[PDB]
Each structure stands twice: as structure tokens, then as C-alpha cells.
């Protein structure tokens, strides 16, 4: 499957001029475009090599569309300020998520538009792609609006054609990338500890994409409980690393095994210290 997700960020900043506006888009799990306000020359630029396959009109087109949006929001920050009854002396945030997904058959599986005011759901279009779900009375206001204005109707078309259609191009503009797969290199490390016990650590490094799964088992069953774990992290060179550890009775080290599941690993990996 594949997706096209645009992440919107609007943040007002008292006594510091117009709200800051950021537009970041991701294909599957890759940043292919960016648009910042504060930046010297706010040009909706590319973050992917393969995005060179777009003439100066795409750029120019998407940059105006953006400057437009940037404006609708400053108004929305003001709109919301009115709804909730909050002063002009407070910093606030608007968060939107627009995009769509297609299956092996490029046929749209799920599309959506989700909002968040100050780090909390504000409103979001339903799977039905025709009705909305509001978080608070404020959203209701907007819902009332968008209902008569048939917004969900207009957003239904975007997700089916427009989006899915652009989501086709891009994929072709850089298939030899958004399809690559790097195999998680794994190993274990021994570490001494107080009152005699030991910490076996399982490493996975330089893998891609990002979701991989690391788990420890003991004589068959997973120790999904009583095993430390870190959030998958980025090395910095397009790759990701992550590890999982567990405390085991010194001497009785071998009775444990580490399992690595990843879309690059045809078969899950088995490790041991």
C-alpha cells in the first residue's frame, strides 16, 4: 500500500508578528516537500531527489496555494480565539492532517482530514468521508458551518481523485527509492550488574523503513512484560536504530532469545549473547 500525507502547522506568537506557518508533506514515510513562512524566501521546496521531475510551474503553483492557506489560518487562529474566549496574549496551535492511501491496486483504501487545536483533537472527517466528528462545542460551530457549506462533500472529491491521482505520479517520480529496504543489523551485548544478574541488549541498526519489531522470549514465550525498550530512533543517514533489553539470572544467559521482525527480513532473526 501507499499514502500521501500532508502535515499542517500554524502557531500564533504574540508580539512577534504573523503566525508561523509550516506545510510538510510525506509520501508513505518520506518528506518530499516543505513550506515555511519565517524562511527568507517561503518557496514550497522539495526534500526528495526524485522531485526534480517537476517543472517551475508545479513549484510556483504549490507556493501560491500555500501562501493562500497561510492566510486562511491566521483567520482561523482568530476564529478559534473567539470561540473559546481567549485573549490576544496567548500562543496557540492549529494542526491538520490531509492525505490519502491506496492499496496494491492503487484503489483508495482510506483518506482523511484531521484537525487539532493546542495539541488536542478539534474536528475530523469520518471514514464515511461525508460526516464529521467534533471534539468540543467549538468544533460544533465549525461543523455547523462546514455542513451547510457542504465542505465534506468537496473534501470527498479531493481524496478520491485529486489526491490518489497525485499519489500516483510521485510514486513513479521516485519508485526506485520509496521501495528500497535495508536489513536490520542485529547483535546482543552482555552487561554486568548489582547483586548478581545481567542485562542482555538486542540491537537493530541502519534499518529502513522505520517499523521493525524487537522482542525477547524465554523458552518459548515472549517477555513483552519486564523488558526495557526505546522508541525507534533515526541515525541521521536515512536509517533507523532501536534496541530492547532484559534482565536475566547471571549464568543462565542462554535461555533467552531476541526476535527481529522487519519487512526487509524475509524471515525473523534469532539472536543470543
Amino acid at each position: 500500500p501507499h499514502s500521501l500525507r500532508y502535515f499542517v502547522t500554524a502557531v500564533s506568537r504574540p508580539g512577534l508578528g504573523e503566525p508561523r506557518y509550516m506545510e510538510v508533506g510525506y509520501v508513505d514515510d518520506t518528506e518530499f516537500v516543505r513550506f515555511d513562512s519565517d524562511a527568507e524566501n517561503p518557496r514550497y521546496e522539495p526534500r526528495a531527489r526524485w522531485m526534480e521531475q517537476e517543472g517551475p510551474e508545479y513549484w510556483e503553483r504549490e507556493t501560491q496555494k500555500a501562501k493562500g492557506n497561510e492566510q486562511s489560518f491566521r483567520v482561523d487562529l482568530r476564529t478559534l480565539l473567539g470561540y473559546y474566549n481567549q485573549s490576544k496574549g496567548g500562543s496557540h496551535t492549529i494542526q491538520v492532517i490531509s492525505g490519502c492511501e491506496v492499496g496494491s491496486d492503487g484503489r483508495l483504501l482510506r483518506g482523511y482530514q484531521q484537525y487539532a487545536y493546542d495539541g488536542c483533537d478539534y474536528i475530523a472527517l469520518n471514514e464515511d468521508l461525508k460526516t464529521w466528528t467534533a471534539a468540543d462545542m467549538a468544533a460544533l460551530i465549525t461543523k455547523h458551518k462546514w455542513e451547510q457549506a457542504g465542505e465534506a462533500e468537496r473534501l470527498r472529491a479531493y481524496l478520491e481523485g485529486t489526491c490518489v491521482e497525485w499519489l500516483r505520479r510521485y510514486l513513479k517520480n521516485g519508485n526506485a527509492t520509496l521501495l528500497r529496504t535495508d536489513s536490520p543489523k542485529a547483535h546482543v551485548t552482555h552487561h554486568s550488574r548489582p547483586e548478581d544478574k545481567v542485562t542482555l541488549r538486542c540491537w537493530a541498526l541502519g534499518f529502513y523503513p522505520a517499523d521493525i519489531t524487537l522482542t525477547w522470549q524465554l523458552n518459548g514465550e515472549e517477555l513483552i512484560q519486564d523488558m526495557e525498550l526505546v522508541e525507534t530512533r533515526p541515525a541521521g543517514d536515512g536509517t533507523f536504530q532501536k534496541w530492547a533489553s532484559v534482565v536475566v539470572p547471571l549464568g543462565k544467559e542462554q535461555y533467552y532469545t531476541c526476535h527481529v521482525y522487519h519487512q526487509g527480513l524475509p524471515e525473523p532473526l534469532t539472536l543470543r549473547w
Binding site: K65, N69, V75, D76, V96, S98, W166
Partner: peptide
């Protein structure tokens, strides 16, 4: 090509 946003 991000869609263009309707006001809240």
C-alpha cells in the same frame, strides 16, 4: 499537491 483549506 496539498488541498486548499476551508476556514473554521
Amino acid at each position: 499537491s496539498i488541498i486548499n483549506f476551508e476556514k473554521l
